């Protein structure tokens, strides 16, 4: 089996969540198995980023509904040629 192996032969992007969920399933039984629901949730989150996309949708909706200015250290986009300039 190639499960857990990344494109470079190491551990794939979501290996940690999957391994913690597998630890959970190994320690519990069929009756207790639902106790492992959070771990599996985290695993699926890593796979698909669904809650993260929802949270970003919420933040962006509130952002585009604001005319007041933002005063925080910002993000700046630069050309690849300008990596390290100035």
């Amino acid at each position: 089996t190639a499960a857990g192996i990344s494109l470079t032969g190491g551990r794939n992007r979501c290996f940690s969540e999957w391994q913690s969920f597998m630890h959970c399933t190994a320690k519990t039984d069929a009756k207790s198995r639902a106790q492992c629901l959070p771990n599996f949730e985290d695993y699926m989150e890593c796979l698909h980023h669904t809650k993260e996309k929802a949270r970003l949708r919420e933040i962006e909706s509130v952002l585009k509904q604001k005319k007041e200015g933002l005063e925080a250290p910002p993000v700046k986009v630069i050309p690849v040629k300008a990596i390290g300039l100035v």
Partner: protein
């Protein structure tokens, strides 16, 4: 004698009924991972790929 023989037959039939119910229940009992999947490599927890093994990727 007729009553004794019939009672012995009925006892054997009840024994068969008990055995059938017992096998029905046992077949539905959940088995250990070693007995159901793998008896030598019995740890379900994977290790993944070994090439770029990153300190901190292991999580219990």
């Amino acid at each position: 004698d007729i009553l004794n023989e019939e009672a012995k037959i009925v006892q054997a039939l009840n024994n068969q009924r008990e055995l059938t119910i017992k096998m029905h229940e046992l077949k539905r009992e959940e088995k250990d991972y070693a007995h159901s999947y793998s008896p030598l490599f019995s740890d379900p927890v994977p290790q993944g790929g070994s090439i770029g093994k990153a300190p901190g990727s292991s999580r219990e």
